Amino acid sequence: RGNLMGKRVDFSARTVISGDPNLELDQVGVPKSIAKTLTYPEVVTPYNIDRLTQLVRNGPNEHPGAKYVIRDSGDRIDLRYSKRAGDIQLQYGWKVERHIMDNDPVLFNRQPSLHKMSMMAHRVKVIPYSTFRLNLSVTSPYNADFDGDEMNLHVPQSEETRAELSQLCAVPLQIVSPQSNKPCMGIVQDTLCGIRKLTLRDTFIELDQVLNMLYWVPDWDGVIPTPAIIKPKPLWSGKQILSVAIPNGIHLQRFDEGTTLLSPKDNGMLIIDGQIIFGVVEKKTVGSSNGGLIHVVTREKGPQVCAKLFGNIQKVVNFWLLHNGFSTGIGDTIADGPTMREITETIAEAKKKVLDVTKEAQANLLTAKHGMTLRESFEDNVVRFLNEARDKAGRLAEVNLKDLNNVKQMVMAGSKGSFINIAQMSACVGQQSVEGKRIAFGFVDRTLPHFSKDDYSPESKGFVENSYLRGLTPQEFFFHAMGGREGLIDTAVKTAETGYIQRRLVKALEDIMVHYDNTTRNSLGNVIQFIYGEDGMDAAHIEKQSLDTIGGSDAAFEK
Amino acid sequence: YDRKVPSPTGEYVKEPEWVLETDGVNLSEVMTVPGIDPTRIYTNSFIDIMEVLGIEAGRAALYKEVYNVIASDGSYVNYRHMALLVDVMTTQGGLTSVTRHGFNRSNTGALMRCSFEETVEILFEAGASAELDDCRGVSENVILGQMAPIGTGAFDVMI
Amino acid sequence: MIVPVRCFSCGKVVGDKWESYLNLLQEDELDEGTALSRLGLKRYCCRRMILTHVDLIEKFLRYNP
Amino acid sequence: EGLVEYIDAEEEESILIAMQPEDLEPAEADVDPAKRIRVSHHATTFTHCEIHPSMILGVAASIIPFPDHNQSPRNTYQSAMGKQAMGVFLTNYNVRMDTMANILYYPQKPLGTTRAMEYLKFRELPAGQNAIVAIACYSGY
Amino acid sequence: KAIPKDQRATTPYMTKYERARILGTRALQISMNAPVFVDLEGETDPLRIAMKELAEKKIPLVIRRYLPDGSFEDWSVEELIVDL
Amino acid sequence: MNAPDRFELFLLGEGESKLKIDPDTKAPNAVVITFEKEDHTLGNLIRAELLNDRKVLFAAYKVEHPFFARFKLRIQTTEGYDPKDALKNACNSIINKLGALKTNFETEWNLQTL
Amino acid sequence: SNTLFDDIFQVSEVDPGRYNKVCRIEAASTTQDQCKLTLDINVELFPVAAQDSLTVTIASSLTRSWRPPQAGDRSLADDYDYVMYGTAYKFEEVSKDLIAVYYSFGGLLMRLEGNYRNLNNLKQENAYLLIRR
Amino acid sequence: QNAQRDAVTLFCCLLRSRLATRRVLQEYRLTKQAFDWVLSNIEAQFLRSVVHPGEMVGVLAAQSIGEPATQMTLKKVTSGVPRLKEILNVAKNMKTPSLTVY
Amino acid sequence: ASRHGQKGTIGITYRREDMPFTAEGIVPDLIINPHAIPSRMTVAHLIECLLSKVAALSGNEGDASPFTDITVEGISKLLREHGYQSRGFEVMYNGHTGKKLMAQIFFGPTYYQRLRHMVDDKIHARARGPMQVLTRQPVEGRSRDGGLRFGEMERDCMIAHGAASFLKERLMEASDAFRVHICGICGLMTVIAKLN
Amino acid sequence: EEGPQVKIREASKDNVDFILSNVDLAMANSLRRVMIAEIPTLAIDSVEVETNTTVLADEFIAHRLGLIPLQSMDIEQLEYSRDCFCEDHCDKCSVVLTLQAFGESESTTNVYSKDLVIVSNLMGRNIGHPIIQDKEGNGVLICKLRKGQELKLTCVAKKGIAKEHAKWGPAAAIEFEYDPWNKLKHTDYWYEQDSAKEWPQSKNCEYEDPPNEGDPFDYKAQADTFYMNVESVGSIPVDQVVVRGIDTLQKKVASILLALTQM
Amino acid sequence: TLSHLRRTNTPIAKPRQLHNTHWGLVCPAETPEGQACGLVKNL
RNA sequence: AUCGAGAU
DNA sequence: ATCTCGATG
Ligand SMILES: [Zn+2]
Ligand SMILES: [Zn+2]
Ligand SMILES: [Zn+2]
């Protein structure tokens, strides 16, 4: 298990990582000391020598040089000691362990490795500082975040092995994943909060910005596109310049709820030949979605086109935003004075709801729902009542937050947050729960020793009425505590229960592979599936289309 | 429950229906009752499905249940994957656990079953029975450090 | 551990204002907020530098050799 | 003089504890709407009142500024990392020879404080500095 | 066993895996000054030569695709079609 | 440790010329000037005065990456005009404004007390 | 090298839809009672309000980099105040006896609806829009 | 040749639906030349979409469930991780049995 | 980083000029991203920042003591009495260009921690080196120029991709690789290299 | 005179609050940047340590002296140490100082920058004096001593610039604001009810006009007028800070222009 | 140093859970993550 | 090699 | 349940 199927190995490295946006998707910022150490054995040849010798000359301490040289006899020439280390006429049919350089193929992984995607070939770009730098939008597959996450990097030694990395393993090949027949790489955080606000109808960009932005895009054709607005002052729309990043022959149609080829909500999405016609660009369009700009551009234009795409989208939006800016206060969790009044009483009405059902139940009038205890149908009624109270207080809040409220602004992008996150911050936090049920009686017949016994009211059984804003009470806090201990527990218990699943799942299937007869069988030749997936089709090459033979009138089938 | 079904006129529409949900299982006797539809009746015990309706129905619950596990979290996984899993479990004739009892007593060469839960024992009863390891399996060509019957190594190269 | 010559964020000298500051609180009987303003510290990054800098040095000196 | 008692878990079972002594037992008789919503007096029995509530918290958490307006597992996270916070661990670091010991150059008492920071000697032996922070998308690095 | 030039079913298109290592094994020979059967409009890197040796199907290898019983089928890199 | 010495920001290495000029292949009458060991302080002031001149079509700059002290100015100009001049005229235009200012400040400095 | 459509409209509604720099306008035509318009407009640059009378043209000119001025000394179809340029994207048979076009001026959309606009509002990229007085 | 007919089935039901005479001519007004392109294109586009012999689906299908398996965390049912655990154990000892009769 | 379970690594260092600035001339020591605030509901962080601004200004201790009648309002009101807007925002100018930022920004003294776990204590890299006696595999740990484990699991990933030869190369030419002789009959490591 | 224009308002030994009129923002900025990070200064870039019995560590103390403000009026007739043809220093490119203090008393003996002691032949030029704006006469608090502790040092100040390390900032803090009321609308204010009771009103609204509500947006408006305030540290008096900045800015524009001349 | 003096350890129904009666004696927040979460507590 | 403390 | 650290006979 430990020494045969999973060895420790030479030619490998590991560092802290951090995110860098001016770095193409399929690239990896390798810091310089590491590239000063790691080595690929190159074989001397007419084609290379000139460069190659300059390395040997340079020596193993100025970046683009090398260590050791190896000869016919296989003797090892140590370029760091050795008298003859400013010398050495390179003789065809030798080798020259050399410093990893710009544009080499390397396997860049993060543990735990629960995919193909947790291991991908990247394109080296040597840099100062000591961080494996990488592109934001290669986050999801690795499952990284930059709070100290550490990452391994492996280096191929064989000409064939290099091929195996660039042709099978490479990042742009992995974009459109077979796993969920969709793309696994999207546009996240700053980039995405921006891929949007740039986009609003309202957002207008005048000549001087435009010109840097245009330029900022590498592929840019060098043709200032005609501004939407020419009148008083010749302006360009957000949409407009972002359209530049989009290549050509690209077609996309969305439609959400209130959408109409006029889109008075600037809803949905319409894009005709690398040109954006209406609708805000946000996660649905440019996330790791299925209908996804990225699912399209990949299959349509190619892997390498969509790979550069990411960079360009980023570079422009990352720029624009940098000059527009964005933030978040506690003001973004405050909400209207009269609403806090409405929110409060909206809770209050649910506290009498439960009270009443408590008082009803206390008189044996509460009837039992077929197949559960009166006590379970008391509990159930109550829990619901205060869940429906939290929610409604929440929704009440989702409304004050105006279209400029920075929390809501990230929410509308689909960049970070959710309704719940607003609910709990601005409104009420809600009911606390342990093992599904509301807060137990650890003490005898009471929750804490600040309560009278036999008290099934909310307060007492772990309803947190306040928000994370106003602040919790001693009791609320302590229940709330119990809340996310249970949380923390099964989190680090989910991770083990699962780490075993992914081991057995793997260990049973493992040797299965489609053979050259499009069957699907194991080591013994015992057949499992007579055609892979029952249509002999790779999952990556597949998408949600509609079968309009299925639905609609016998009339309108015939119409 | 809510059901989507043909109207006479062609449109699919909401005919809402009346289903009974149980706490306990005896398929053997509930489908034989009057008034139920024995053509539909479902148990989450894919184990009870199998012993009753044969292996090929069993499969199609095992899946259905694996699906409802993944799907109830929002997540979509393309069929084939889960299909394969389900297909492998269900082809020896019976239901075959993804633990050392199902998939690790299953005829295979020895070195493969080695690389998993009961290592030594399996090497011993491989020793005494005088098993002949094929060397067609992934795990085995990794041990001996050779090119695996895999993407790159499935074919051969020549002239 | 001794005043920090020049405030991190802003850059204005402040190491030259410590003894002066201690003398404004303890002696003419003032609140730190006025003392801070009197010593020409008007921004708050420059302010927070004096109002915090905690003078551990007075404790290590405490040790003999 | 019998003003205080040492109660354990078991005996805690047979009592009634008040949270605040103030707002919890004067006579019953407007509400600044941004204040939180504490419950009521619904109790007449009280045998001994909690000294103050922030003493359910242990050494680490009592360092946190406003842990009440804070999701509970966050607090827990911080309370593992304050123990990885660089600062002065003792006055006499200069005379103690231990494998590894870090100290900050310009230790700085915090600006936001807890009343239980006094007994935890944290303003005297800080860890961490008082940085001007800016919440903004800038370069997107 | 064997199999004829006929009676072949085995996808006439190239697997990515096939291509991968054909490219790989060629890249190798090129990188060890074995001769180049193309003209180099101006390239050095062994792989990107092999890539161009391939796309003008001037590569002299033969795949041997095994079937799971114990047979197989031969395929020159002239026959196989590079789509992808 | 992998940190580079600071001076590399404003001191030129070996065979590294403040300006390297190449002709943009995409457009016509257009140019891309690299500026070694200089940053926004320069590039932004050059671009702005490159845009006030009315025989200029286009101009923009970009620090390709903020580790390195470089920056790329791209100018396209009228049929006739050669950007080197459009850059020259610019630079000077600037120098005067500053000389003007340097004087004008120095004047109004001297009139005040304290 | 010519014009494509012309008419004087009057505005009924002026709608700021969670926006401070654009309003979409539903206006109608004096003249022909089979026609109306819809127009997303920059109302900071060129304001617009209640029961207003606006003039409209489409056109296809007065396509390389956009040069600007040097054109305080040049040709300009700018006897008009407000002026945009868009791509056109659908030609909707309202059925009839009636037809509607759809233009996009960098997300500021346009609806129109008539029936002589046939041999007169091509199917095309070109589509300036000029709005005077 | 009967498996072939049966691997293609569902694709064609689409193909024909989105290639009906009315539709080709009336809905999306194609021309001979463009149509005969659309025709040649699909063929290629299909062919590319086949599985390549070598594909180690065994592993791939495990990872593709084993991953989102590690991403589950928190109306009375055994569900998520513990159910998955049940399922793959082939649980005789199961916790939420239920008949669901129509 | 911070004090409410909100950690971070430095991504980059900018010089005071390139930093966005407040009109008073102040610049930030440290900028965090606003995208790590919705999903961990670290509200205090924010409150601390507002409190700590006021207190640095007024020259009074910040009381963030837990159970209290201190209020976001109760603070904000004071922050105004002092001249700044009551939710800690300030108008900032992107220093690159000078131009005002379109958005206004949450700006304040916030108590931050430096943590152990710095980079130049982690940045190991091996390129062949020493090996263990028994296994002849590379050694555990950077502390002796050790390797990095290409675990069972990372193997699974190379199998998925279809990379056979890279698998061999990683599991042989780096790490263990060893030639033995073997009987062509009683198939065993029983042979006898009288090699020479 | 011609274009770019100044109106001083307040003026001090370290403050220069002025209006900078008729300019591109472009250059108002690029001036401020240079002013921070690019006008040269003397400060201590080589401490040579004989004996340190102090509480504080060597390289700690070293740090502080580096950050000590030194006179830099006649800096521009001193040479960069990299440019002089000498081995290491001379008096032609560096200025050396010495610190001697020794715990003598019982009652905590202090070490100020005031105890820094020029040594190198100045060549009679105004350079490398510990700057003191302290009232009671002692600049910076270098470090503290007990009964029997020594500090025996040798500082070597060199020419340098913020870009290299911030000890060579002559600058401190630059105030900078344009268009007090948002007349150009370069920001979009964040509001809870009223955008104008919520943000305050800078002193800078006094020396400009309101907007007479009814008026529409001034669309082809740009930025003239930029309200600044350069706070000097002391190394250079304030006037020279804005000046030499205007100079140095000019000077590196020069180098480009003259670098086409060379090309 | 304070914390690590004021620590608790437990070897091995459901003990990791913050339990009601911990109120006041054991700290509800202070505890390590994963591995031994909620077994280790602080006072 | 036994052992506990940490990063994920 | 991939990593670093310390301690220990
Ligand atoms: Zn300051
Ligand atoms: Zn033998
Ligand atoms: Zn000299």
Curated annotation (Swiss-Prot), chain B:
Q: How is it modified after translation?
A: The tandem 7 residues repeats in the C-terminal domain (CTD) can be highly phosphorylated. The phosphorylation activates Pol II. Phosphorylation occurs mainly at residues 'Ser-2' and 'Ser-5' of the heptapeptide repeat. The phosphorylated form of Pol II appears to carry, on average, one phosphate per repeat. The phosphorylation state is believed to result from the balanced action of site-specific CTD kinases and phosphatases, and a 'CTD code' that specifies the position of Pol II within the transcription cycle has been proposed.
Locations listed in the record: Nucleus
From the record heading this protein, give the residue positions of the covalent cross-link Glycyl lysine isopeptide (Lys-Gly) (interchain with G-Cter in ubiquitin).
K64
What is the protein's known function?
DNA-dependent RNA polymerase catalyzes the transcription of DNA into RNA using the four ribonucleoside triphosphates as substrates. Largest and catalytic component of RNA polymerase II which synthesizes mRNA precursors and many functional non-coding RNAs. Forms the polymerase active center together with the second largest subunit. Pol II is the central component of the basal RNA polymerase II transcription machinery. During a transcription cycle, Pol II, general transcription factors and the Mediator complex assemble as the preinitiation complex (PIC) at the promoter.
What family does the Swiss-Prot or TrEMBL record give for this protein? Belongs to the RNA polymerase beta' chain family.
Protein name, please? DNA-directed RNA polymerase II subunit RPB1
- Of the parent protein, the shown chain spans 1287 to 1445 of 1733
Swiss-Prot record, chain C:
Q: Which UniProt keywords apply?
A: DNA-directed RNA polymerase, Isopeptide bond, Metal-binding, Nucleus, Ribosome biogenesis, Transcription, Ubl conjugation, Zinc
Cellular localization per UniProt: Nucleus, Nucleolus
Q: Name one GO cellular component term.
A: RNA polymerase II, core complex
Tell me which residues bind Zn(2+): C7, C10, C45, C46
Please verify whether the record's keywords include Manganese.
no
Residues joined by cross-link Glycyl lysine isopeptide (Lys-Gly) (interchain with G-Cter in ubiquitin): K59
Q: Does this UniProt record's set of keywords contain Lipid biosynthesis?
A: no
Coiled coil residues, start to end: none
Concerning PANTHER family, the annotation shows:
DNA-DIRECTED RNA POLYMERASES I, II, AND III SUBUNIT RPABC5, DNA-DIRECTED RNA POLYMERASES I, II, AND III SUBUNIT RPABC5 FAMILY MEMBER
Q: Which family does it belong to?
A: Belongs to the archaeal Rpo10/eukaryotic RPB10 RNA polymerase subunit family.
| Biological role stated in the UniProt entry | DNA-dependent RNA polymerases catalyze the transcription of DNA into RNA using the four ribonucleoside triphosphates as substrates. Common component of RNA polymerases I, II and III which synthesize ribosomal RNA precursors, mRNA precursors and many functional non-coding RNAs, and a small RNAs, such as 5S rRNA and tRNAs, respectively. Pol II is the central component of the basal RNA polymerase II transcription machinery. Pols are composed of mobile elements that move relative to each other. In Pol II, RBP10 is part of the core element with the central large cleft.
Q: Which HAMAP family match?
A: RNApol_arch_Rpo10 (MF_00250)
Per its record, how is this protein called by name? DNA-directed RNA polymerases I, II, and III subunit RPABC5
Which species is the source of this protein? Saccharomyces cerevisiae (strain ATCC 204508 / S288c) (Baker's yeast)
Gene behind the chain: RPB10
Curated annotation (Swiss-Prot), chain D:
**Compartments in which it is found:** Nucleus
Return the similarity comment: Belongs to the RNA polymerase beta chain family.
The remark listed among the other comments is: The binding of ribonucleoside triphosphate to the RNA polymerase II transcribing complex probably involves a two-step mechanism. The initial binding seems to occur at the entry (E) site and involves a magnesium ion coordinated by three conserved aspartate residues of the two largest RNA Pol II subunits.
Question: What the protein does?
Answer: DNA-dependent RNA polymerase catalyzes the transcription of DNA into RNA using the four ribonucleoside triphosphates as substrates. Second largest component of RNA polymerases II which synthesizes mRNA precursors and many functional non-coding RNAs. Proposed to contribute to the polymerase catalytic activity and forms the polymerase active center together with the largest subunit. Pol II is the central component of the basal RNA polymerase II transcription machinery.
How would you summarize the oligomeric state and partners of this protein?
A: Component of the RNA polymerase II (Pol II) complex consisting of 12 subunits.
Q: What is this protein's record name?
A: DNA-directed RNA polymerase II subunit RPB2
The shown chain, on whole-protein numbering, covers 687 to 833 of 1224
Curated annotation (Swiss-Prot), chain J:
Asked whether the keyword Membrane is assigned, the reply is no
Question: Mind naming one GO cellular-component term on file for this protein?
Answer: RNA polymerase II, core complex
Q: Where does Zn(2+) bind?
A: C84, C86, C90, C93
Q: What is the effect of changing K7E?
A: Transcript termination readthrough
Q: What family is it from?
A: Belongs to the archaeal Rpo3/eukaryotic RPB3 RNA polymerase subunit family.
Assembly: Component of the RNA polymerase II (Pol II) complex consisting of 12 subunits.
Any idea what this protein is called? DNA-directed RNA polymerase II subunit RPB3
Give the organism the record lists: Saccharomyces cerevisiae (strain ATCC 204508 / S288c) (Baker's yeast)
Q: What is the lineage of its organism?
A: Eukaryota, Fungi, Dikarya, Ascomycota, Saccharomycotina
